[PDB]
Design a protein around this ligand. Structure first.
Ligand code: OQ3
Ligand code: OQ3
Ligand code: CL
Ligand code: CL
Ligand code: MG
Ligand code: MG
Ligand code: MG
Ligand code: MG
Ligand code: MG
Lengths: 7, 236, 236, 7
């Protein structure tokens, strides 16, 4: 799972 | 709407309290009520809307992946038949997730996007539209899958076109959009080379513009650049 | 304010429901919340405000009169001593009544009257100010009694001056004001001749202007004229 | 009690 725009 | 009787400012206040209490379902319901008042959202209010729904759908997506993995193992050779329960429960979670995505997409269509004229708001909402179509695409398996993927692509592409014309390469909304569109290419569109090229070009153009920024803006931009770098390390 | 989180329109809607359910305390609390939103009130909203508080204070006044009569009988010669309870309970009801009057007067002062420029709104609010000082005067027995009576008189007189200049003699607000000011003269100011003269002149001037009215306006005006006639029959 | 403006 790639990092998306969160937190 | 169950929030129709509450003041807009009270809904905003309660969304912030819900965030502090980690009550993200409540947060999202308060922000939906605020959107439905019909006024445009400020920068801070747009962030509250996005945080609320990202947390709600993030929990649903994580649960869906757990259940989908169990279901896939049930369909291996040598696995005992356990009946319809795993599929049924995965479908239940999937339907709820789709419902949340449809709710967000409905808010964007009625009428956040059409009323958003500044680049910062319009790009933000179009990015969200791409994201929630992307989450629909993660679970799609039927005859509309291609159209769901194209809806995500089209929203991201419009957001990219505006962001490149109207915003500096270090702008956090522009960077987060490019990050998410790269993830779309890698995870949804079977286009890992496009994902890598977009992440690299985005990172490099932001790096070249950091010299223009204050210390606080530099911190904001470099945080998102590190996510792009993390993905490039994973992908290469 | 406990109504600060509710929409103005929802407070109005609930005030109307409370009226239908004969829940006048609730009605008054909803209308207080609506006033505290800070916007001017429409004609219908002013009527809801007045009906709500008139019903609340009307119940308190009726109870106060029952208790005051019992207390007066307790102070007759030959009446047994029953302790402080009758006075204590009359004082309790009296303090609550004074609190409601102070609440209404506070709404008028902050800021309904100062924002009321049309004759129909300004006369209405000044009449209310006279009425709630009159209700304070009904229970007053101390060193401020004269000033309470003069506050009622002054508000009524300002309302009368505006009503005579700006409104026809059949206008229901003008008529209701004159009715209540006549009651003030008779019951508060020890001026029965002034009460009779005001009721008679008001009735006669309205009678002479009825020919100008539609059937519905004629019904509205003659209803209040009959109250003036009822008082004149009682007083003469 | 005289009638005032009510109901
Ligand atoms: C740090 N960060 C989150 C990781 S990209 C952001 O600045 C951010 C937050 C929200 Br809400 C929306 C967007 C859109 O691009 C970007
Ligand atoms: C019939 N009627 C009540 C008896 S006067 C009214 O038209 C009325 C109602 C309200 Br609320 C306020 C006023 C003020 O003058 C007059
Ligand atoms: Cl189930
Ligand atoms: Cl008591
Ligand atoms: Mg409001
Ligand atoms: Mg706009
Ligand atoms: Mg710009
Ligand atoms: Mg005004
Ligand atoms: Mg006039």
């Amino acid at each position: 799972k790639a990092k998306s725009c969160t937190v | 709407g169950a929030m129709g009787s509450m003041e807009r400012a009270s809904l905003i206040q309660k969304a912030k309290l819900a965030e502090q209490a980690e009550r993200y379902e409540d947060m999202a319901a308060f922000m939906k009520g605020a959107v439905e008042k019909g006024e445009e959202l400020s920068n801070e209010e747009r962030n509250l809307l996005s945080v609320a729904y990202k947390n709600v759908v993030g929990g649903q997506r994580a649960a869906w992946r757990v259940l989908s993995s169990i279901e896939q193992k049930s369909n291996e050779e040598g696995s005992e038949e356990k009946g319809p329960e795993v599929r049924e429960y995965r479908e239940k979670v999937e339907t709820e997730l789709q419902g949340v995505c449809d709710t967000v997409l409905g808010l964007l269509d009625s009428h956040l996007i059409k009323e958003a004229g500044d680049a910062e708001s319009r790009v933000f909402y179009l990015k969200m539209k791409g994201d929630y179509y992307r989450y629909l695409a993660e679970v799609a398996t039927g005859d509309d899958k291609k159209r769901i993927i194209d809806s995500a692509r089209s929203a991201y592409q419009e957001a990219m076109d505006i962001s490149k014309k109207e915003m500096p390469p270090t702008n956090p909304i522009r960077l987060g959009l490019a990050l998410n569109f790269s993830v779309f290419h890698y995870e949804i569109a079977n286009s890992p080379e496009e994902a890598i090229s977009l992440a690299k070009t985005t990172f490099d153009e932001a790096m070249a513009d950091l010299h223009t920024l204050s210390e606080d803006s530099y911190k904001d931009s470099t945080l998102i650049m590190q996510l792009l770098r993390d993905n490039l390390t994973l992908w290469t």
